[PDB]
Curated annotation (Swiss-Prot):
InterPro entries documented for this protein: P-loop_NTPase (IPR027417), Small_GTP-bd (IPR005225), Small_GTPase (IPR001806), Small_GTPase_Ras-type (IPR020849)
Effect of substituting G12C: In lung carcinoma; somatic mutation; also found in metastatic colorectal cancer
Effect on the protein of changing G12S: In GASC and JMML; also found in lung carcinoma; somatic mutation
Protein name as annotated: GTPase KRas
EC numbers on record: 3.6.5.2
Organism, scientific name: Homo sapiens
Post-translational modification: Acetylation at Lys-104 prevents interaction with guanine nucleotide exchange factors (GEFs).
Modified residues (N-acetylmethionine): M1
SUPFAM superfamilies xrefs: P-loop containing nucleoside triphosphate hydrolases (SSF52540)
Origin superkingdom: Eukaryota
Glycosylated residues, chain numbering: T35
BP-aspect Gene Ontology terms: actin cytoskeleton organization; cardiac muscle cell proliferation; cytokine-mediated signaling pathway; epithelial tube branching involved in lung morphogenesis; female pregnancy; forebrain astrocyte development; gene expression; glial cell proliferation
Reported function: Ras proteins bind GDP/GTP and possess intrinsic GTPase activity. Plays an important role in the regulation of cell proliferation. Plays a role in promoting oncogenic events by inducing transcriptional silencing of tumor suppressor genes (TSGs) in colorectal cancer (CRC) cells in a ZNF304-dependent manner.
Amino acid sequence: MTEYKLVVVGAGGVGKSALTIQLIQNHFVDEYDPTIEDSYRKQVVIDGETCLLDILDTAGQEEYSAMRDQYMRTGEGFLCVFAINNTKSFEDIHHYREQIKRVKDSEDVPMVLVGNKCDLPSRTVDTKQAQDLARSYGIPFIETSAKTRQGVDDAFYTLVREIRKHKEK
Ligand SMILES: Nc1nc2c(ncn2[C@@H]2O[C@H](COP(=O)(O)OP(=O)(O)O)[C@@H](O)[C@H]2O)c(=O)[nH]1
Ligand SMILES: C[C@H](CN1c2ccccc2Sc2ccccc21)N(C)C
C-alpha cells in the first residue's frame, strides 16, 4: 500500500470540502464551513495497487507562511478545482500554478484541472477555455459535479496516475 498525498487547490466556494467528502463518506454535504480544514484517508485499489490517498481540504490563509509552503511541498498531487459559473476562481488558477511551481521549486507538478458544478447554469467558463488552459500547463481537465458525481472518481484517479508517471519519470 503506497501512501499518496492528494491536496485540493481552489478558491473558497468551489466545493473543495464537498467533492472530498463525497468520495470519502460517499455522500454530498450541502452545509459545511469553508474554514474547516482537515485531511482524509482512503485506500483505493487503482490499477491493481491499493494506494492510501490522503486528501487535504485546505482552508486558504494559514497562520504562518512556512506552514503554507510546507504542506505544499510535501503534497504529491494538486487537484485544481474551479467553478464553471465563475470567472474569478478560474483566473485564480493562474495564481495557484505560479505559486505551487515556486513553492515546490519544480515546473513538473502533477495537477488536474477540475471544473465543478457542471450541472449548474450560468456557465461563464467555456469548456474550450479550461481545456486550452489545461493543455498550456500540460495537465488534464475533467468537468465534474459534487451533486451528480460526474467524472469525480475519474478526476481523482487521473490525479493519482499523473503522480505515478511523474515518479516513474
Ligand atoms: N450546487 C453545488 N454546490 C456545491 C458544490 N460543491 C460545493 N457546493 C456548496 O458550496 C458550499 C460550501 O461547500 P464546501 O464543502 O465548504 O466547499 P468549499 O468551501 O469550497 O471547500 C456548500 O453550500 C456546498 O454544498 C457543487 O458541486 N454544486
Ligand atoms: C494539512 C495538514 C497536514 N499537512 C501538513 C501539516 C502541517 C505542515 C505541513 C504539512 S505537509 C501536508 C501535505 C499534504 C497534506 C497535509 C499536510 N493538516 C491540517 C491536515
